[PDB]
Design a protein around this ligand. Structure first.
Ligand code: HEM
Ligand code: HEM
Ligand SMILES: Cc1cc(N)nc2cc(-c3ccc(OCc4cocn4)c(CN)c3)ccc12
Ligand SMILES: Cc1cc(N)nc2cc(-c3ccc(OCc4cocn4)c(CN)c3)ccc12
Ligand SMILES: Cc1cc(N)nc2cc(-c3ccc(OCc4cocn4)c(CN)c3)ccc12
Ligand SMILES: Cc1cc(N)nc2cc(-c3ccc(OCc4cocn4)c(CN)c3)ccc12
Ligand SMILES: [Zn+2]
Lengths: 413, 416
């Protein structure tokens, strides 16, 4: 049955037919909704499971290019059946690889940035065999995507999983991240989100400069071997010093962030195939930049410190001192990136774009999967147009999936 | 489903195990292939039959006698047999006063969208099942207002009018809240007063109300008893406690002329206990600051309160990325908390409320086996990620007794 979604601000009502085409489960049941669980519940598939999934993807592909049932389509289906038959797997044509990767982004229910979905630069790295080659492919990705600040969406796709013992993995969660150091007293130098990975890198031989914004080395695993450390040429890492248009002391917080958000620990699934290394990158929404959790000193947060320098009453919560210092930190982030002509988007324009994207998707595609819990920005939610937009969340393939951290699965040698 | 379900707090890494979800009763709207958690709502003659009512009554009576540690007792088995005989010979049954009180507290305890549930057991229940006329509803509602308000030291309360029978004799409060401000659509397309209430204001005017046509005209009560046509009553203005909105730093903020009422009192919802339907059950607590909807008022023509506040703050409003909207919204929310506290009217900020709810949710998982929660509604409309509920995973499921939506009465009422 069709389903309606209403916008309660504009009273616009959209009809979803696209959800009838999903068959990956969401994790909810008729009796329990799990829409706020982050991962709501071995990975190597047999030929038996493979061809259905491959056939489904070849079918929607040849339907995307208005040739469903053509000689080309009939033949491509036979070609893939033969290849699954003899090799227990198959290889995507370049066109399929590009179409499938764009559509994984299009189907990412949690991504507010999807209006750009079809402008994606796809780098085919399926010939890669070693970590040195990964490092070369990733430097090219970084250099292309960054583009002296005029950022450009890209993805680099390394060879697909075979038996599971030969995975390609980028052990970093992002290509560019800052190191976090657990301290003597107990606090944290650098980015606290990365303390575990930082200790893994030190244990692997990395010599930490032990600063606040130490770019972490790339830790790269090719064909299931042990991972190897590589330093990204510093000239490829574009950074933005964070300053404030009104507060001239903000620059004295010593803060900066990197320009390129490039997520490197997810799994790309296309037509039954699993690409366990597929770093993809776009540009930031201002609210993502997690500099607020840095420690200015040995006791006070970037929130606490900013509100301190703003001379706010921090004795009680009802003064909303956290809320004021949050807005100012985000003003500073957007002002700084814009002053350096580094691509960034504010959460107002981003959510506005996404509503317009939803309209497009319901017109041409009969729906758009969307995860309200993740689409709604992490501040000022109800004054953005997504807050009052009803959304239907469902799981379409090709897709980006979660996968275990490699240091929990890997048998060293 | 499996027996255990785990939720994770990603800020603290605490994991909680939920077994209460196995007692969930009705559908959520979601399926295994689609999630409807952001959908707001996933004949009058149709009431529960004998065959439908029996198991629902039994389920509730069992749950009640279990709660008072008398399950399987003589008194439990006798109450069961008495209910079964009322249903058999009258097609319905009457709750005991104890059962009504327990039912109402647990509809609140089970309200997955309420951040305020840490208070659920401290709820004054007013039994109004002897009411027969709209004048008597007015009496009961005036005493609810006066009790709940308590000169600014607000106390949560619910007043429960007779249950539904054949669906042709419903009691209804036509107001959406006991206290709301009138909104008047103008011939030029602008709005005076509160635009959220334009439709109901027009119903009141059509029902004979003479409006003052001001910014903050308290609407009249529109009260239907026993399925009769509703009738209009003015709340005595001395019962409506109000707070002028001023700002601790901005002297000019008082010049906006804003005020709001103290007592949030929702009156269009349906209370379901043991299969019985109480279509009129106004209930009230106190506000979280972010609720107070003064920001949508028009200061002048095309400028609402957000725009006007940003104008008086001299913020650049030419581009969104200056975050002028965000900045103005914080100051509005500061003034609202400052005003209620200065006048000693009960109010809670979103930081305190969500912190209390996390404490409450952990206790419920501990002592009840779970706590249904609707993240989409629990997380506040501003500064979500810096409140403790943003990073908290939740399970949403529908337990009974419950508060439910019902269609507006003007859509279904047969006029006499
Ligand atoms: C082009 C500009 C883009 C913007 C502004 C953007 C914005 C966002 C934001 C704000 C989130 C949520 C982040 C959070 O809450 O922590 C998100 C999630 C996501 N983005 Fe986008 N994004 C962009 C591009 C892309 C691209 C190019 C891809 C892949 C081809 C992509 C794939 C995803 C995925 C898969 C998620 C979900 C992660 C998950 O399921 O855990 N995004 N995006
Ligand atoms: C004691 C102070 C209370 C506070 C601070 C509070 C807070 C809230 C808030 C902020 C919401 C969501 C509002 C929105 O998103 O627009 C809500 C929803 C709700 N509250 Fe509470 N509440 C309180 C008392 C009560 C009481 C006494 C009852 C019933 C006995 C109740 C029942 C509900 C219900 C049923 C909903 C959801 C309504 C719906 O689904 O449309 N609340 N509450
Ligand atoms: C291409 C891209 C651009 C952008 N501008 N933003 C992005 C954000 C994510 C993203 C967000 C949250 C995620 O979930 C874990 C998490 C850690 O911290 C907060 N969430 C994951 C999973 N790797 C990815 C992924 C891709 C992004
Ligand atoms: C329900 C929900 C919605 C949403 N839209 N997003 C979420 C993001 C997280 C999440 C989990 C881990 C994270 O990372 C570690 C951490 C940060 O702060 C405390 N722990 C972060 C941010 N990094 C976010 C958790 C839940 C989320
Ligand atoms: C006792 C109580 C206290 C309080 N402090 N707050 C409350 C808020 C609601 C509430 C919130 C949203 C609702 O519905 C969606 C909506 C319409 O407009 C804005 N939200 C409804 C249904 N009447 C009730 C209900 C009860 C509340
Ligand atoms: C997905 C969602 C989550 C949430 N947590 N809450 C919501 C609140 C509304 C809603 C509906 C009607 C309303 O009433 C009239 C209106 C004003 O602005 C737009 N509609 C209001 C606010 N009064 C809010 C709609 C959706 C909501
Ligand atoms: Zn769901």
């Amino acid at each position: 049955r069709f389903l309606k979604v209403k916008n309660w601000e504009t009273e616009v009502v959209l009809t979803d037919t696209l959800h009838l085409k999903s068959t990956l489960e969401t994790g909810c049941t008729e009796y329990i909704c799990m829409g706020s669980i982050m991962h709501p519940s071995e990975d190597v598939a047999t030929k038996d499971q493979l061809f259905p999934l491959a056939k489904e993807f070849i079918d929607q592909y040849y339907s995307s290019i208005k040739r469903f049932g053509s000689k080309a389509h009939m033949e491509r289906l036979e070609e893939v059946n033969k290849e699954i038959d003899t090799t227990s797997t198959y290889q995507l044509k370049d066109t399929e690889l590009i179409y499938g990767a764009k559509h994984a982004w299009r189907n990412a229910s949690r991504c507010v940035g999807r209006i750009q979905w079809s402008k994606l630069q796809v780098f085919d790295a399926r010939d890669c065999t070693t970590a040195h080659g990964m490092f070369n492919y990733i430097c090219n990705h970084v250099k292309y995507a960054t583009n002296k600040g005029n950022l450009r969406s890209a993805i680099t796709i390394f060879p697909q999983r075979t038996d599971g013992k030969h995975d390609f993995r980028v052990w970093n969660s992002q290509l560019i991240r800052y190191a976090g150091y657990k301290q003597p007293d107990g606090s944290t130098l650098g980015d606290p989100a990365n303390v575990q990975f930082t200790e893994i890198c030190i244990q692997q031989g990395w010599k930490p400069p032990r600063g606040r914004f130490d770019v972490l080395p790339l830790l790269l695993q090719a064909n299931g071997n042990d991972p190897e450390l590589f330093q990204i040429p510093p000239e490829l890492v574009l950074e933005v010093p964070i300053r404030h248009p009104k507060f001239e002391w903000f620059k004295d917080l010593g803060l900066k962030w990197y320009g390129l958000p490039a997520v490197s620990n997810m799994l790309l699934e296309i037509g039954g195939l699993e690409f366990s290394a597929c770093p993809f990158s776009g540009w930031y929404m201002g609210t993502e930049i997690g500099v607020r959790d840095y420690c200015d000193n040995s006791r006070y947060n970037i929130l606490e410190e900013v509100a301190k320098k703003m001379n706010l009453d921090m004795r009680k919560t009802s003064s909303l001192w956290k809320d004021q210092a949050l807005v100012e930190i985000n003003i500073a982030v957007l002002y700084s990136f814009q002053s350096d002509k580094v691509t960034i988007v504010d959460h107002h324009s981003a959510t506005e774009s996404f509503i317009k994207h939803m309209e497009n998707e319901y017109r041409c595609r009969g729906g758009c999967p969307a995860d309200w819990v993740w689409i709604v920005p992490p501040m000022s939610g109800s004054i953005t147009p997504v807050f009052h937009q009803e959304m239907l969340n469902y799981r379409l393939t090709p897709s980006f999936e979660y996968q275990p951290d490699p240091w929990n699965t890997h048998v060293w040698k």
